[PDB]
Design a protein around this nucleic acid. Structure first.
Lengths: 45, 72, 50, 150
RNA sequence: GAUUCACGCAGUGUUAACGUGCAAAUUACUUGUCAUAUUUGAGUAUAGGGGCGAAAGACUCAUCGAACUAUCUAGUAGCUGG
RNA sequence: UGAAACUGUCCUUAGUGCAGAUCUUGGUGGUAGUAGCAAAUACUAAGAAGAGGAAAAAAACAUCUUAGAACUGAAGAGGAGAAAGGUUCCUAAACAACAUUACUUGGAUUAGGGUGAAUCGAUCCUAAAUUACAGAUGGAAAUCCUUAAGAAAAGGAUUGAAAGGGAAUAAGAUUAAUAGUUCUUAAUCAAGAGAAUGGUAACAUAUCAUGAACUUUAAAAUGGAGUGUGAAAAUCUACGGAAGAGUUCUCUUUUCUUCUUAACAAAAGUAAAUUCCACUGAAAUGAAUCAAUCAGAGAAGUGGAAUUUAUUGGCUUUGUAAGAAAUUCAAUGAAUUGUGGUAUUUUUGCAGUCUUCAUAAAAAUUAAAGGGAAUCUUUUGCUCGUACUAAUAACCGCAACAGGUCUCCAAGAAGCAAAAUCUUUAGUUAAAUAGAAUAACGCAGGUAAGGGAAGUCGGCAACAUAGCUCUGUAAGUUAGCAAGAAAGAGUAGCUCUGGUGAUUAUCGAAUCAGAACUUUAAAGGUUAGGGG
RNA sequence: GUCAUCUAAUUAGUGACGCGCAUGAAUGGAUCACCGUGAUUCCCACUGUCCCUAUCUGCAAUCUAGUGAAACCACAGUCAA
RNA sequence: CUGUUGCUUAUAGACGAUGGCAUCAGAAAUCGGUGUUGUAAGCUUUAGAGUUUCUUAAUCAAUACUCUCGGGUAUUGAAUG
């Protein structure tokens, strides 16, 4: 709901070229479910 | 509550259109017209109402049949 | 109201008919000053008292 | 293009509210061309417009509560909020007991266990609040029959 | 023409809000009341030295110790301003 | 600069000279890019259309679809009407102005479309009341009278209700919008056209089975309260399935949705209540209700008749009528549509009881009686209203104003409760603009060490008590009350036990009492008396 | 007013006294049980009323983008005598 | 040189201002320290009053035992790396 959000969230952002114009770029933030956040550092997928 | 609130219940007509003068001056409960003096045969005119006389009188309408007669 | 007299409805219809504007061709006449109908009213702007 | 007309027309054909109408989002140009009820009905038959199912409402929680309260689980002092007469009306208990006790005496008179004079005497005793329930009246009748034969 | 709660209603207190306001009298909580001397719609009756009033000179279309409107009327002013 | 009239001198004439009058009318500044655009819980993501989210985060982006999250919470922000409004209704094009930002949106602009009745209403009848001819009154305008004054009207004239009375229509489908009005099917009503039997009796016979003048009776047509009960619907629930959906790594023979039926008629089966009829005659008085109440001008018993119970005849059932409709499956065509309940609410009747110094309308219209004067088919059904809002945006308040305005239908939980609180069907997410920062002073909601009204005109404001069960309860008193006086104890969860019925072991009702065990020791989330 | 009483302390309250400026009998006199969003005093309980203030939340206020009034205004606006 | 700007910047702050760093900048996680609350979820102690059923066989059962000084939180205006 609007009143509560998870204290820690893990996301995956991907820089991609825009379909309409290839020279320009855009970000796509997605959700990566995890069982726990222990031992999770910034990984370049 | 004599101001804004008391105006909400005003949805009952007092006057409606009159058959002889066409104005909304026919009193529904008095059964007479406040303006042209209905069923009374004579039209309602007063000397203190000089503007009322210059609003509805002879010459304020079509004069369908008198315009030919006086021209004749 | 939903229920209305016969004559009262015809005087309602005429008020609808008179709420129109000047036709374009009438505005192109020579020496014409009538551009807008100043006897116009709208249901939510002025009540016609009838 | 606003699909307000199609949403309203579909709700009248599907016989549901505007909240139960589902217009497929991937063929807006196909849906927006239907400006009549005849055209909408074709879109419904072709599964372009479907009716959402009603939101589920389970009575399982209420069912378990009644099951526990049948066994008197929550019917304690601290869960009683109305007066004694409010929860169990006293007058209706009298009407229930009067019917039960007067029915028994009517059954015995026609069966011949008691006669009219004995039936009449017990009738005013029943009305006088003498016997709490059926068993007390049956005991009194049984006792009174033995005094008769002595 | 008992005691109370509720749908509603009123307007006891805050002398709260607002006070070039949501509003030319309203809002919030609190309080009182919430069917027989009750609440309420439409129809109908009562008109200005008149009506109507469980009576406050209260109410009679935001107008009342005498309504509104027009005429007498450019009322009169030893008073005030130009 | 401007582009067609004007000037000097002398006499004559005057609507003849403005800084003020809170002067009149019009226009315009400072204030000032200031005060504001803060009631109604709330929006986010992806896509489409569009000139209209750009960018060094310019942190915000109107409309439509989908997803998530929500609110009104069914005495609604739902679905419909009366008054009032009057085209505001629907569609398309289009956005200059308007809805305190903007708008592709609109109750805004432009242009077309839309309102179908023999059965719904007006029309008909009269109620409070209202108005005519003649008459009476008055200087006059005009007032009075409403059947009394009349050579007027078998008897008293006109109007007066879209909530009073009233001949007769329902289901399904259909439109961008009208629908008891259109279409299909199925009915009804009015106006027409073609001197009898049966039963002891109460009373009964698809028209039957004649019935004039005149008279009478009844119906239309009559308060409220409270109690019991019949029936239907809704909710809940038991048994038996069919079809579809949800959950499923942890379980769940599981949770959820559908399983329907009209007007008008028929009469297999079968109810409750009241009133009458026949037989017989009650005392050793009986009969009966929740309460009552009744009986020799005749009880109870047995056997009957009648009426009421949302159309025929109340319920099931039947024709209508499954061919409709709902739920599924397939690519127009196929599948199913049992039976219950000693539960609750609403509606609708019925039965008696209570209450009044209150007794709680009339006519149009209809039927019957007393009386004895006389000797199935088909046609038509005219006039008018009918769109839409009915309100936190269509009504009245200068307005898209937190004010005001008459009604109908009305789910689950929980509880005494149509209370507060949460949800379902339906509706809506916008309703005088947002983003950032998180200073003082504010408005709204709170908490607090120790003390406890010392504050103040004054316990103003806030705090505090609060449901239910048991015990107990003073003075005073009009003997009815005071009284929920005051005061004290109990209350949770889990596992059990007993009481209160129906049919002859099974079936069902939530209610009361009791006992062990455990714990965070229990009315208090909401609702909820401070006392003397 | 004087006497009691209520309090540590009483122009307040209650109960008495009465030559009562100027009470008094349907202009009604005396007496109150119940009742009252009526006026007054005192106790218990409770509490930010107070000793004496601290602190929390929402909405604004602050700044910005769009939009954008009003009352008022002789001219104006630093003091002492 | 100074200012803008960036760290959604602090020892500062209504806004300006003021203070710091600006490529060895900054930010971010994760890890350890340091605090808060009180022993997560799954299976096990017949823990376990009783009921129930097969009849010592299970069940269902508030609460309780071991794993468990557990689990969760922790700059947001906390400290290292």
């Amino acid at each position: 709901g609007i009143r509560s959000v998870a204290d820690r969230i893990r996301v995956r952002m991907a820089r991609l070229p825009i379909e309409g114009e290839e020279g320009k770029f855009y970000t796509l933030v997605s959700y990566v479910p995890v069982a726990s956040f222990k031992g999770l550092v910034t990984k370049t997928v | 509550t004599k101001g804004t609130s008391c105006r909400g219940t005003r949805h009952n007509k007092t006057h409606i259109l009159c058959k002889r003068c066409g104005k909304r001056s026919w009193h529904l409960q008095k059964q007479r017209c406040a303006s042209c003096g209905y069923p009374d045969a004579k039209m309602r005119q007063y000397a203190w109402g000089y503007k009322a006389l210059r609003r509805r009188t002879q010459g304020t309408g079509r004069m369908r049949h008198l315009k030919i007669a006086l021209k004749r | 109201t939903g229920h209305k007299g016969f004559s009262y409805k015809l005087k309602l219809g005429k008020k609808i008919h008179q709420n129109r504007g000047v036709p374009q061709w009438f505005r192109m006449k020579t020496g014409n000053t009538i551009n807008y109908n100043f006897k116009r009213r709208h249901w939510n702007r002025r009540k016609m008292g009838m | 293009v606003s699909l307000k007309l199609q949403k309203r027309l579909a709700a009248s054909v599907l016989k549901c509210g505007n909240r139960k109408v589902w217009l497929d989002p991937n063929e807006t140009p196909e849906i927006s061309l239907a400006n009549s009820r005849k055209a909408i009905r074709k879109l419904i038959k072709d599964r372009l417009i479907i009716k959402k199912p009603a939101a589920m409402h389970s009575r399982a929680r209420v069912v378990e509560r009644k099951q526990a309260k049948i066994l008197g689980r929550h019917t304690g002092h601290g869960k009683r909020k109305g007066t004694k007469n409010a929860r169990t009306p006293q007058k209706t208990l009298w009407i229930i007991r009067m019917r039960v006790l007067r029915r028994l005496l009517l059954k015995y008179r026609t069966t011949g266990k008691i006669d009219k004079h004995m039936y009449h005497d017990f009738y005013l005793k029943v009305k006088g609040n003498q016997y709490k329930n059926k068993k007390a009246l049956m005991e009194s009748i049984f006792k009174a029959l033995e005094e008769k034969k002595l």
